[PDB]
RNA sequence: UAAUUGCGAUAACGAACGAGACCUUAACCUACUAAAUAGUGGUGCUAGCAUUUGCUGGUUAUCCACUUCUUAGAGGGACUAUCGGUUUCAAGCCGAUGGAAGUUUGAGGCAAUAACAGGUCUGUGAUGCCCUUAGACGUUCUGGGCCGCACGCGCGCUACACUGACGGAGCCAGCGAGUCUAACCUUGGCCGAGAGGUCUUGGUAAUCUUGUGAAACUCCGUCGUGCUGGGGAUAGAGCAUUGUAAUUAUUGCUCUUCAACGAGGAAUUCCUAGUAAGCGCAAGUCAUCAGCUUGCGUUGAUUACGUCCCUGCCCUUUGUACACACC
């Protein structure tokens, strides 16, 4: 069978599933190429893993990611996390740990959140206020 | 003769050990199964003010009743289906069997 | 005390009802401001719609239209294009 | 009221609960209503074990001068409890070690 | 969407329906000045007159202006939907009108006076200067009096 | 205007009426070994550089 | 090497396809295209009042190709927006049923999309093939 | 530079701009330093960041924000006034436009002019409104470098917004000219004008 | 503020005074043996007891 | 036939109703709670009491 | 210490409630058990492009494999773990390392003795006393009123704009609710600008409404520094629904009308990170009616990281003519 792994990236309520396999180097998001991710301002945030690591490790790797849940920025972050984790997992599983180790060091030198899910989760709202900490305006007279 | 036996309750322990005994009874007689598949728990939530009169600070509280639902897929002749249905009954667990 | 008399209440009826330059930009083009803009756009190392309004007294709409036409002529080289802001230089051979 | 409350807490204590507490609120003797408490043993109020162990009941008794409220709280024996936890969450029962005799001469016991 | 040296045909102000109309604003937002025609009505009559939307009101021509005011005066003959008008059904005629300029002011004062002389509650409230559509007057709209 | 530069070597707790200012022990980078104590309006660790518009002034306490 | 609607910019694709329908002129343009608004939630007619129907048709064609199948209600929900109930805060209201249904009916007339099982509209074979043709045209005009 | 190819094309400009060295879209974090030995630690410059958008936790500690690039702090401060809260996409668009205008109006690095401006407009001494018997007395107090950076960014953004309020001049260009004025110490700069007023009143009430 | 409480401290000293030879320095080992050597009704309490036991093991090994 | 949520809430209110009726009618016999036994084509409710002879 | 949390001291020892401990919820699991009411992948059939070998899809009776995402249940995992400074060198504090999480891991539930002459007999068939009890204060029927407006005050919703308005595009969540012998959630089709009307459909519900295709947001356009395309308050005319019945307009929709407001005085509110704030969604009441509330999610900041100056809290000492207790 084709050498492949299945990874995911999460941020807030957004999840993304990335199928990674040996191939020719295509990156399609919901069937659309990576150069089509909106917003364009976070488009380079999406490119950040390949831009940091060099595409020689992307030359013969087929990756396709599908997203669901969350908002646009959350989906963008989920995408970048998913493809970073996919690269690390593939290099560990199919090539070696020297590859996985340099990959991990290069990734962490620029960001910790690519391999690590965002620990901050939304705080539940409490009664008496619109938000989770705010309260209704206090009037005495 | 396909049956998708579905259980629903509020007590996790009773519902789950009923499901376990059902699946163990089925497995030893070797009826085809698709696991005791567990639906997401349904939280019936009611929000109400603690004070019955309207005075005091504006306080709000939530009461939760959690509903757990399971179903087991089987195919079995009626002779063993009768024993499967009648073998185990526990309080608080609503049981119903359907065809296919 | 806090219980006001009926006269104090009726004072509400006497409280009464008292309580506590335009720009003239171009908007329409004409020959003088034509020649003015085509002579001064070879300058202004930074050019945008706001700079056009600032240094030529243009009507904003005419600023955007003139930006498009001068980009057609190639005298201003855009550095970026956006639906809410535009950026232009003098397309110099020195910079 | 005093005699009845004492009798009920005595009955619970002779039955074998870990604690009981009966409180009667209302007019009682005089017009100014008061509350009298008759606890004994020990009961808990806050921790989640209040759900498993405390059996609390309240009743209105209609008497000629008005209404008296009776609250009875019974904290039953955690060990007697048939199901659920067998003790309070802070109960740490350390089983006594079995005394070991130090060995001096290594040896082999054959098959 | 082009640069062109506008000739002396551009007048900086004009007169329509006894109401002055600005010339430096676009034709739609200039025609909004006539009371009784807003953004929707002025845009629709501009499109039905087929004058260029990008054109201001100052540099138009007398012919297009006359066509515009004619469409405004009588919309029905010019395939204007009956629901688009501000007088969808007149209080004493079965016809649908569209009142502009001083005419709509006159029609509004006759409306209020008619309500007053029939002694409807709406007319009574308009006579007294009060809220007519059942709002809460206990707390709002005080300084107007 | 001339300025002077000094690294902080130790912090000496908070001071001020609301506790919004801090006492620190600074030491001029040039002309070493002349240590003085100063107030600071803001967050401070050890080993920060602080620029003074006047060197020799001191403030032991603040109300 | 394979050209699909998913392979190009959504906005530029809809622009190109709307221009193509304008040039073709075979799309059934309704009578009140220049009169009414696209939803009660909006306040102004579309600004490019002559090609806006072509824009809408191109966008709904791209969306229908991208999706399994959609209907009038999904159309209004997508093309609606937040409207102010006066002073009261913005409430989300759907688009106009007449426009979002007439665009689909005209697109069926041209044959781009077909009424499909499970309800709703689903892209046609010919509509599909010409959509990828237009995508190829865009990927040609780009360079 | 080596042009590696892919089945899904990756732009040549992207490849040549970022793959060889962790640059920005147009600019580069290299050869960019700060003038102040007080700020060499708290400016975070000389660290590749690429886009100024990041979800990293910068508030867990009092000094955790020191590791944040001051470009991202700028973007954080552009969204402040009321309605603009959130909208970090708008913030990064504005800051990108500002850097573009900076490199249009001059030749040096935008991420050089910004650090020059903040180190020029950093308040070195402030006037604490401290309490007292009857009449409040101002007290001249030395400003920590982190507080210097914070107030510097604050005055920069407040001046940009107050200049852009209710006029044609958009926030991007107005903050660009505020940044050039703050780099060159212009009196037209709200940031340095306010910093000078604060330091001079501190000098008076030393 | 990570001060352990009376119940965990008393359980720790009780465990140590009668299971020193069977106790080790490895927190995981003490955690795993606690589940068999003492009846604790909570995993969190078990882990806290284990951690304090190892802390005291280090104390004894120091003196 | 009814939904599961409505079925279970109706079961709960039915339990409360039989309990409150049993404590309004059987308070003199040491009523101490009830349990509902539900089986298909058969349901029984077991009453815990002290004067079981009198409740009989 | 967050803590009467403990270390210790000790005429007190031994205890109890409280805090803690506990429980729920949100975060980690390539580990277990699995899953046509959640999926993915491959091979079938088929669409389009490539024409090609590959790309994106459609189709569940194409079957097969798996549980990564999704659901769960059983568990593990965090115990300040490890290191280094620091403290009768203890309790513990701080920095660094790892780790999903290292502020009680984050947020809540429960929550002590004593008390208020706090609120409620307009929830109660829970009642004492008093009153009324048949042209009753019971009940019912009809129509008004609880909204009435010279004014004042308290929650709030919109704004005063280019970090914008408007028009086109991209367009992605979660919490949860829903009818059957009674009418709910309603997809799809058709008509109508629109509200809406009509014929059907799936769902007693992870299966259908619903990927609630939400908004804010992004991109392309128009404007233009001003009472302007901001604001739509007040009014007129008309169009439908809910409801026996809308008028003292329920609400929705169309056109027209376009008022104050130019960042708001003395004062005052809330708040430490996914929190403030913005933006909507679900549900509650409901035949219809949200600007309200309970929750949910999207976008998502600077400043804190301390103190007793203002308002106060807890402990000890102290003085007292205070005890209904500084009012």
- A48 C-beta neighbours (distance < 10 Å), count: 22
| Unique residue bearing structure tokens 């308009």 | E126
| Unique residue bearing structure tokens 């409890």 | D81
Tell me whether F9 touches chain H (CB under 8 Å): no
| Unique residue bearing structure tokens 């960001």 | A111
Paired tokens of G35: 């009169």
Give the start-to-end residue ranges of the domains of chain A.
Answer: 1-141
| Unique residue bearing structure tokens 């806090």 | C2
Tell me whether H96 touches chain A (CB under 8 Å): yes
Whether G44 sits inside 8 A of E84 (CB atoms) is no
Question: What is the four-CA torsion angle of A72, A76, A82, A83, rounded to 10 degrees?
Answer: 150
- Sorted by where each starts, the structural domains of chain I and their CATH numbers stand as 6-61 (1.10.60.20)
Tell me whether G43 touches chain E (CB under 8 Å): yes
- Rounded Cα distance, H113 and C78, in Å: 22
- Rounded Cα distance, A83 and A61, in Å: 11
Paired tokens of G119: 């309800």
Q: Which residues touch A64 (CB under 8 Å, ≥6 apart)?
A: A18, A19, A26, A27, A28, A29, A31
Paired tokens of A117: 């899910």
As a rounded value in angstroms, the CA-to-C1' distance for D62 and K136 is 28
Whether B69 sits inside 8 A of J7 (CB atoms) is no
Helix (H, G, I), strand (E, B) or coil at E16: strand
Give the start-to-end residue ranges of the domains of chain G.
Answer: 1-143
- Rounded Cα distance, B65 and B67, in Å: 7
CB-count exposure of residue H94 (10 Å: 0-12, 13-18, 19+): buried
- Rounded Cα distance, D111 and D105, in Å: 19
Helix (H) or strand (E) holding H160: helix H145-164
Query: Which residue pairs from G103-106 have beta carbons closer than 8 angstroms and sit at least 24 positions apart in sequence?
Result: G103/G53, G103/G56, G103/G57, G103/G60, G103/G75, G104/G60, G104/G72, G104/G75, G105/G28, G106/G27, G106/G28, G106/G29, G106/G30, G106/G57
Positive or negative torsion for Cα A90, A92, A96, A101:
positive
Most distant CA pair in chain J, distance:
40
Identify the CA nearest to D69 among candidates D39, D12, D10, D28: D28
What are the CA-CA distances from residue J48 to residues D58, J19, J44 (Å)?
18, 11, 13
Q: Nearest nt (C1') to G39 (CA)?
A: K194
Paired tokens of A112: 């910790």
Paired tokens of H37: 């030995």
- Rounded Cα distance, A61 and A23, in Å: 5
Nearest CA in chain I to D91: I40
Paired sense of beta strands F35-41 and H137-143, if any: parallel
Chain centre to alpha carbon of residue G106: 11
Helix (H, G, I), strand (E, B) or coil at D18: coil
- Rounded Cα distance, H131 and C23, in Å: 49
| CATH architecture type of domain C29-91 | Orthogonal Bundle (1.10)
| DSSP-derived secondary structure letter, E56 | B
As a rounded value in angstroms, the CA-to-C1' distance for A75 and K283 is 27
* C70-93 CB burial, b ≥16 within 10 A, e <16: bbeeebbeebeeeeebbbbbbbee
Residues of chain B found within 8 Å of residue A128, distances taken between Cβ atoms = 57-60
Q: Which residues touch D39 (CB under 8 Å, ≥6 apart)?
A: D9, D19, D20, D21, D22, D23, D73
- List, in sequence order, every residue forming a beta bridge with B43; answer none if it has no partner: B66
What sections of chain B are H helices per DSSP?
Answer: 12-29, 78-87
Whether F63 sits inside 8 A of H131 (CB atoms) is yes
- Experimentally, the structure was elucidated by cryo-EM
Q: Nearest nt (C1') to H90 (CA)?
A: K163
Q: Nearest nt (C1') to D34 (CA)?
A: K117
The answer to whether H168 and H199 are in contact (CB under 8 A) is no
What are the CA-CA distances from residue D104 to residues D97, D101, I22 (Å)?
21, 10, 19
Tell me whether F63 touches chain H (CB under 8 Å): yes
- Rounded Cα distance, F34 and A47, in Å: 53
- List, in sequence order, every residue forming a beta bridge with J53; answer none if it has no partner: none
What are the CA-CA distances from residue E8 to residues C28, C37, E11, E58, J47 (Å)?
11, 20, 8, 11, 104
CB-count exposure of residue F46 (10 Å: 0-12, 13-18, 19+): exposed
I55 φ/ψ sector (left φ>0, alpha ψ -120 to 50, else beta): alpha
Residue with smallest Cα–C1' gap to K174: A13
Paired tokens of G137: 């045209």
Helix (H, G, I), strand (E, B) or coil at D98: coil
SS (H, E, C) chain I: CCCCCHHHHHHHHHHHHHHCCCCCCCHHHHHHHHHHHEECCCHHHHHHHHHHHHHHHHHHHHC
Positive or negative torsion for Cα H107, H110, H111, H112:
positive
Chains H and F touch (3+ CB pairs under 8 A): yes
Paired sense of beta strands A27-29 and A61-68, if any: parallel
Q: Which residues touch F52 (CB under 8 Å, ≥6 apart)?
A: F3, F4, F5, F6, F26, F38, H124, H142
- D78 C-beta neighbours (distance < 10 Å), count: 17
- Rounded Cα distance, H70 and H72, in Å: 5
The answer to whether F5 and H142 are in contact (CB under 8 A) is no
Q: What is the CA radius of gyration of chain B?
A: 19
- Rounded Cα distance, I3 and F14, in Å: 26
- Rounded Cα distance, G134 and G19, in Å: 11
- Rounded Cα distance, H119 and A62, in Å: 48
Residues of chain H found within 8 Å of residue F48, distances taken between Cβ atoms = 38, 41, 144-146
Paired tokens of B96: 């119903």
Paired tokens of E69: 């005011």
Q: Which of chain K's bases lie under 7 Å from a protein CB?
A: 1-3, 5-7, 16-28, 30, 33-37, 40-41, 47-51, 54-60, 68-74, 76-82, 90-93, 95, 100-115, 117-121, 123, 126-129, 147-164, 166-181, 186-197, 204-206, 209-229, 231-239, 247-258, 263, 265, 268-281, 284, 290-291, 293-309
Q: What is the number of helices (H) and of strands (E) in chain G?
A: 5, 4
| Unique residue bearing structure tokens 């249904």 | G101
CB-count exposure of residue H15 (10 Å: 0-12, 13-18, 19+): buried
| Unique residue bearing structure tokens 């007590």 | B11
- Rounded Cα distance, A6 and C2, in Å: 75
- A3 C-beta neighbours (distance < 10 Å), count: 13
Residue with smallest Cα–C1' gap to K125: J24
- Rounded Cα distance, H127 and D84, in Å: 65
- A12 C-beta neighbours (distance < 10 Å), count: 18
- Sorted by where each starts, the structural domains of chain J and their CATH numbers stand as 4-56 (3.30.300.20)
The answer to whether I54 and I30 are in contact (CB under 8 A) is yes
- Rounded Cα distance, F7 and H144, in Å: 11
On the CB side of J55, CA atoms within 13 Å amount to 18
Q: What is the CA radius of gyration of chain D?
A: 24
Positive or negative torsion for Cα A31, A34, A40, A45:
positive
Helix (H, G, I), strand (E, B) or coil at B12: helix
The answer to whether D27 and D56 are in contact (CB under 8 A) is no
Whether A31 sits inside 8 A of G9 (CB atoms) is no
- Rounded Cα distance, A72 and A62, in Å: 24
Q: Nearest nt (C1') to G93 (CA)?
A: K214
| DSSP-derived secondary structure letter, A127 | T
Containing structural domain, residue B73: 1-100
The answer to whether H139 and H127 are in contact (CB under 8 A) is yes
Whether I39 sits inside 8 A of D88 (CB atoms) is no
- List, in sequence order, every residue forming a beta bridge with E14; answer none if it has no partner: E21
Q: Per 3-state DSSP, what percentage of chain J is helix, strand, and coil (rounded to 5)?
A: 50, 20, 25
What are the CA-CA distances from residue D63 to residues D22, D35, J23 (Å)?
18, 16, 19
Q: A64: distance to nearest CA of chain H, Å?
A: 11
As a rounded value in angstroms, the CA-to-C1' distance for D59 and K131 is 30
The number of residues in chain H equals 206
- List, in sequence order, every residue forming a beta bridge with B37; answer none if it has no partner: B71
Q: What is the number of helices (H) and of strands (E) in chain B?
A: 2, 5
* B90-99 CB burial, b ≥16 within 10 A, e <16: bebbbbeeee
Residues of chain C found within 8 Å of residue E59, distances taken between Cβ atoms = 28
This PDB structure is determined at a resolution in Å of 3.1
Residues of chain B found within 8 Å of residue A136, distances taken between Cβ atoms = 58
| DSSP-derived secondary structure letter, H17 | I
Report angle CA A81, A82, A88 to the nearest 5 degrees.
Answer: 90
Query: Which residue pairs from H84-93 have beta carbons closer than 8 angstroms and sit at least 24 positions apart in sequence?
Result: H88/A73, H88/H53, H89/A39, H89/A41, H89/A42, H89/A73, H92/A41, H92/H51, H92/H52, H92/H53, H93/A41, H93/C82
* Number of independent structural domains in chain B: 1
Identify the CA nearest to J45 among candidates J25, J4, J17, J24: J17
The answer to whether H49 and H114 are in contact (CB under 8 A) is no
| DSSP-derived secondary structure letter, C47 | B
Positive or negative torsion for Cα C39, C43, C49, C54:
negative
Q: B45: distance to nearest CA of chain A, Å?
A: 15
- Rounded Cα distance, D72 and D57, in Å: 5
Q: What is the CA radius of gyration of chain F?
A: 11
DSSP string, A41-102: TTHHHHHHHHHHH-GGGGTTEEEEEEEESS-HHHHHHHHHHHHHHHHHHHHHHHT-HHHHHH
The answer to whether H164 and H170 are in contact (CB under 8 A) is yes
Positive or negative torsion for Cα D49, B51, D68, D62:
negative
Identify the CA nearest to B97 among candidates B87, B88, B9, B84: B84
Helix (H, G, I), strand (E, B) or coil at G81: strand
């Amino acid at each position: 069978a084709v050498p492949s792994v299945q990874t995911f990236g999460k941020k807030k309520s957004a999840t993304a599933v990335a199928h990674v396999k040996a191939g020719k180097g295509l990156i399609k998001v919901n069937g659309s190429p990576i150069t089509l991710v909106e917003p364009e301002i976070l488009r380079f945030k999406v490119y950040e893993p390949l831009l940091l690591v060099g595409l020689d490790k992307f030359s013969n790797i087929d990756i396709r990611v599908r997203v669901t849940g969350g908002g646009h920025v959350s989906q963008v972050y989920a995408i970048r996390q998913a493809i970073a984790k996919g690269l690390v997992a593939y290099h560990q599983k199919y090539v070696d740990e020297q590859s996985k180790n340099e990959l991990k060091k290069a990734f962490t030198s620029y960001d910790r959140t690519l391999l690590i899910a965002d620990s901050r989760r939304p705080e539940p709202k409490k009664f008496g206020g619109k938000g989770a900490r705010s309260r209704f305006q206090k009037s005495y007279r | 003769i396909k049956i998708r036996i579905t259980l629903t309750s509020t007590k996790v322990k009773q519902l789950e050990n009923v499901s376990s005994n059902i699946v163990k009874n089925a497995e030893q007689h070797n009826l085809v199964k698709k696991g005791p598949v567990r639906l997401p728990t349904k939280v019936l939530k009611i929000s109400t003010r603690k004070t019955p009169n309207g005075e005091g600070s504006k306080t709000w509280e939530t009461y939760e009743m959690r509903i757990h639902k399971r179903y087991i897929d089987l195919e079995a002749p009626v002779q063993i289906v009768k024993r499967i249905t009648q073998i185990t009954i526990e309080p608080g667990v609503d049981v119903e069997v359907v065809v296919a | 005390l806090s219980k006001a008399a009926k006269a104090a209440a009726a004072l509400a009826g006497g409280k009464k009802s008292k309580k506590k330059d335009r720009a003239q930009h171009a908007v329409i083009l004409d020959q003088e401001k034509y020649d003015r803009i085509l002579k001064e756009v070879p300058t202004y190392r930074y050019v945008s719609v706001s700079v056009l309004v600032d240094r030529l007294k243009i009507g904003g709409s005419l600023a955007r239209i003139a930006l498009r036409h001068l980009e057609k002529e190639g005298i201003i080289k855009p550095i970026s294009k956006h639906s809410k802001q535009a950026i232009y230089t003098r397309a110099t051979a020195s910079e | 009221i005093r005699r009845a409350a004492y009798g009920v807490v005595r009955y619970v204590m002779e039955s074998g609960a870990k604690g009981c507490e009966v409180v009667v609120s209302g007019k009682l003797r005089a017009a100014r209503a008061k509350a009298m408490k008759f606890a004994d043993g020990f009961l808990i109020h806050s921790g989640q074990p209040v759900n498993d162990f405390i059996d609390t009941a309240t009743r209105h008794v209609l008497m000629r001068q008005g209404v008296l409220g009776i609250k009875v709280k019974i904290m039953r024996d955690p060990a007697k409890s048939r199901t659920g936890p067998k003790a309070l969450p802070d109960a740490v029962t350390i089983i006594e070690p079995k005394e070991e005799e130090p060995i001096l001469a290594p040896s082999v016991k054959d098959y | 969407s082009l640069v062109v040296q506008e000739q002396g045909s551009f007048q900086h102000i004009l007169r329509l329906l006894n109401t002055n109309v600005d010339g430096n604003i676009k034709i739609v937002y200039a025609l909004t000045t006539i009371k009784g025609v807003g953004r929707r009505y002025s845009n629709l009559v501009c499109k039905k007159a087929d004058v260029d939307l990008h054109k201001r009101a100052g540099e138009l021509t007398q012919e297009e202006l006359e066509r515009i005011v004619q469409i405004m005066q009588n919309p029905t003959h010019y395939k204007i939907p009956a629901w688009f008008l501000n007088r969808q059904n007149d209080i004493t005629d079965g016809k649908d009108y569209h009142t502009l300029a001083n005419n709509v002011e006159s029609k509004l004062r006759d409306d209020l006076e008619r309500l007053k002389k029939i002694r409807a509650h709406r007319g009574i409230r308009h006579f007294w200067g009060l809220r007519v559509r059942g709002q809460h007057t206990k707390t709002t709209g005080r300084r107007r009096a | 205007t001339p300025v002077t530069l000094a690294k902080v070597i130790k912090v000496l707790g908070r001071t001020g009426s609301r506790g919004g200012v801090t006492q620190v022990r600074v030491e001029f980078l040039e002309d070493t070994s002349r240590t003085i104590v100063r107030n600071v309006k803001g967050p401070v660790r050890e080993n920060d550089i602080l620029v003074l518009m006047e060197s020799e002034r001191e403030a032991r306490r603040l109300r | 090497p394979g050209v699909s609607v998913r392979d190009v910019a959504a906005q530029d694709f809809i622009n190109a396809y709307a221009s193509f329908l304008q040039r073709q002129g075979k799309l059934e343009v309704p009578g009140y295209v220049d009169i009414v608004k696209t939803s009660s939630g909006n306040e102004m007619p579309p600004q490019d009042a002559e090609g806006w129907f072509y824009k809408r048709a191109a966008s709904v064609a791209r969306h229908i190709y991208m999706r399994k199948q959609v209907g009038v209600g999904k159309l209004n929900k997508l093309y609606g927006g937040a409207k102010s109930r006066g002073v009261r805060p913005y409430k989300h209201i759907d688009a106009s049923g007449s426009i979002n249904r007439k665009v689909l009916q005209a697109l069926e007339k041209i044959g781009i999309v077909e009424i499909s099982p499970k309800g709703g509209r689903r892209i046609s074979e010919n509509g599909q093939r010409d959509l990828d043709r237009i995508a190829a045209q865009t990927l040609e005009e780009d360079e | 530079f080596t042009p590696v190819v892919l089945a899904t094309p990756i732009p040549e400009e992207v490849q040549q701009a970022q793959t060889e060295i962790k640059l920005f879209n147009k600019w580069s974090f290299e050869e960019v330093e700060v003038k102040d030995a007080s700020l060499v630690d708290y400016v975070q410059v000389r660290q590749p960041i690429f886009v100024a958008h990041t979800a990293g936790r910068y508030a867990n500690k009092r000094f955790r924000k020191a590791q944040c690039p001051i470009i991202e702090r700028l973007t954080n401060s552009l969204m402040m006034n009321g309605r603009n809260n959130g909208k970090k996409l708008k913030a990064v668009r504005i800051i990108k436009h500002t850097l573009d205008i900076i490199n249009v109006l001059t030749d040096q690095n935008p991420i050089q002019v910004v650090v020059d401006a903040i180190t020029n407009t950093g308040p070195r001494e402030d006037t604490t409104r401290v309490g007292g018997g009857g009449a409040a007395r101002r007290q001249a107090v030395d400003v920590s470098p982190l507080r210097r950076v914070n107030q510097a960014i604050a005055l920069l953004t407040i001046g940009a917004r107050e200049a852009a309020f209710r006029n044609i001049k958009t926030i991007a260009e107005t903050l660009a000219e505020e940044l050039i004025n703050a780099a060159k110490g212009s009196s037209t700069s709200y940031a340095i004008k306010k910093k000078d007023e604060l330091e001079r009143v501190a000098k008076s009430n030393r | 503020g990570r001060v352990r409480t009376k119940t965990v401290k008393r359980a720790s000293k009780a465990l140590i005074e009668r299971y020193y030879p069977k106790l080790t320095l490895d927190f995981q080992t003490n955690k795993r043996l606690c589940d068999e050597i003492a009846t604790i009704q909570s995993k969190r309490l078990r882990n806290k007891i284990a951690g304090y036991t190892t802390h005291l093991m280090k104390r004894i090994q120091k003196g | 036939l009814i939904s599961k949520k409505r079925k279970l809430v109706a079961d709960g209110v039915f339990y409360a109703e039989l309990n409150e009726f049993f404590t309004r009618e059987l308070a003199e016999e040491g009523y101490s709670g009830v349990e509902v036994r539900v089986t298909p084509t058969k349901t029984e409710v077991i009453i815990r009491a002290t004067r079981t002879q009198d409740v009989l």
